[PDB]
Ligand binder design. Structure first.
Ligand SMILES: N[C@@H](CCC(=O)N[C@@H](CS(=O)(=O)O)C(=O)NCC(=O)O)C(=O)O
Ligand SMILES: N[C@@H](CCC(=O)N[C@@H](CS(=O)(=O)O)C(=O)NCC(=O)O)C(=O)O
Lengths: 209, 209
C-alpha cells in the first residue's frame, strides 16, 4: 500500500476491485479522470497499453484490471489455499471476463437492438457458475473453496450489473440468487454498496445499463 | 501429470501451452476433436463454458486457455521469483490476450476487408512489448525478470503468428525481433517448431492466416 485507482468516473472494470479493497478493510485514493482530461491526450501515451485503469500499490504501477485483481488476491491472501484452488479461481475469473466482454459490447455498440437476444442467451452463460456453486459444498460457501477470493468479487459485480439489465435473470438460478444475497450482505460490502461514491457512479460511460 | 490437451486440430489457443510443455521437457497427449464431431453437439454440453481447450492434469480438469497457462506456470515454476514479478507477468499476459482477441476477430470475421487496417494499427499495439523489454535489462533477457515464464511462451506465439500475417511487422522493433530469434533458438522450442505435428497443424480453423 498505499493504493490509488486511476479511472474514468464509472464503475466499469473497477467496481470489483473497489469492493475487494472495501471488504478487506483497505482504504485507497481515487484519481478520477474526466473525458475532457483524457481527450487532452497527455495521460493516455504514458499508459502502457493506452488505457485505464491504472493502479499504484506503493512502488508498483499496474495496468489491466484482471492483473490488478490477481495482484490483490495474491497479496491479500485471496487466491486459495493451494494450486488446485488457484487454477479453479483463474478458470472462474476468465469465464467472468468473457461474459463481461460480451456485456460491454452490448452496452456500447448495440444496446437498443441487441438487448433482447442478449437477455435471451444469458441463462446459458450463467449456467456454468450455477454448476460450479452446486459442485462446491452445495452452493453454500464461495465460488471456489471455503474462503472468499478475488474471483468472488468479480463474479458478484458481474451478477449485480446483470440484475440491473435483466431483473429476473437469476430467478431460475437458486444458488446464484442466494450467493448474490449472501455476499451483498457482508458488512463491509453492504456499506460500500450504499456509499454515495458507489451509488452516484454510473455503471457504464454512455448512460445505458 | 499425465497431461492431456483436448482441442480442435489447429494451433490457435493451444500452441503457446504446447511450446511451454515441450520446453520444460514434458510430454502430453493430444486428444483431437474434429469440427464435424463438434457439430454433432454431444461434447459441447459437457464443457464448462461450452468451449475448448479442455486440459487434464492428472485428476484436475481445466478449461480456459489462460487459466491452463497460469496453472502450468504455477506448477512448473514459471511465474517469477516474487509477487511483483507475478503481477508484471499477469499484466503482460493480459496485454497479449487483448491483441490475440483482436487477431481472432480479424481472422474469423473480417479478413479480406479489415487486414490492411489491422496491419496499419499493429505497430501501436506492439510498441508496449518493446518498451517492456527495454525496461528489463535492455531487452537482453525475458519479458519479465531473468527467468522464462508462462507469459514468454504466450507472447512468443502471438509474435510468430503476426509475422505470418504481416511479414516484416517486427522490422522497426529491434528488441522484439531479437527476442523472437533468441527464444526460437532454444533447442526444445526449435525442435518443436520444426516438428511435422506443429508444421502440419493450421494456425486457425478457417484456413486464413
Ligand atoms: N483489458 C483492459 C481494458 C481496459 C479498457 O478497455 N479501458 C477503457 C475504458 S473501460 O472500458 O474500462 O471503461 C479505456 O481506457 N479506453 C480509453 C481509450 O481506449 O482511449 C483492462 O482489463 O483493463
Ligand atoms: N476464453 C476461451 C475461448 C475459447 C474458444 O474461443 N474456443 C473456441 C475454439 S478456438 O477459437 O479457440 O479455436 C470454441 O470452442 N468454439 C466452439 C464453440 O463455441 O462451439 C479460452 O481462452 O479458452
Amino acid at each position: 500500500p498505499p493504493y490509488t485507482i486511476v479511472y474514468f468516473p464509472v464503475r466499469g472494470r473497477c467496481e470489483a476491485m473497489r469492493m475487494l479493497l472495501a471488504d478487506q478493510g483497505q482504504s485507497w485514493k481515487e484519481e478520477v479522470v474526466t473525458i475532457d482530461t483524457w481527450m487532452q491526450g497527455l495521460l493516455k501515451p504514458t499508459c502502457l497499453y493506452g488505457q485505464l485503469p491504472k493502479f499504484e500499490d506503493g512502488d508498483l504501477t499496474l495496468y489491466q484490471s484482471n492483473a490488478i485483481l490477481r495482484h490483490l488476491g495474491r497479496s491479500l491472501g485471496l487466491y486459495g489455499k493451494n494450486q488446485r484452488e488457484a487454477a479453479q479461481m483463474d478458470m472462474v475469473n476468465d469465464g467472468v471476463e468473457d461474459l463481461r466482454g460480451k456485456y460491454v459490447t452490448l452496452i456500447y455498440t448495440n444496446y437498443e437492438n441487441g438487448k433482447n437476444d442478449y437477455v435471451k442467451a444469458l441463462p446459458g452463460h450463467l449456467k456454468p457458475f450455477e454448476t460450479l456453486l452446486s459442485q462446491n459444498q452445495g452452493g453454500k460457501a464461495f465460488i471456489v473453496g471455503d474462503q472468499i477470493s478475488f474471483a468472488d468479487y468479480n463474479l458478484l459485480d458481474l451478477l449485480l450489473i446483470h440484475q440491473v439489465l435483466a431483473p429476473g435473470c437469476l430467478d431460475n438460478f437458486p444458488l446464484l440468487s442466494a450467493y448474490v444475497a449472501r455476499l451483498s450482505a457482508r458488512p463491509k460490502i453492504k456499506a460500500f454498496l450504499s456509499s454515495p461514491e458507489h451509488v452516484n457512479r454510473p455503471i457504464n460511460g454512455n448512460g445505458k445499463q
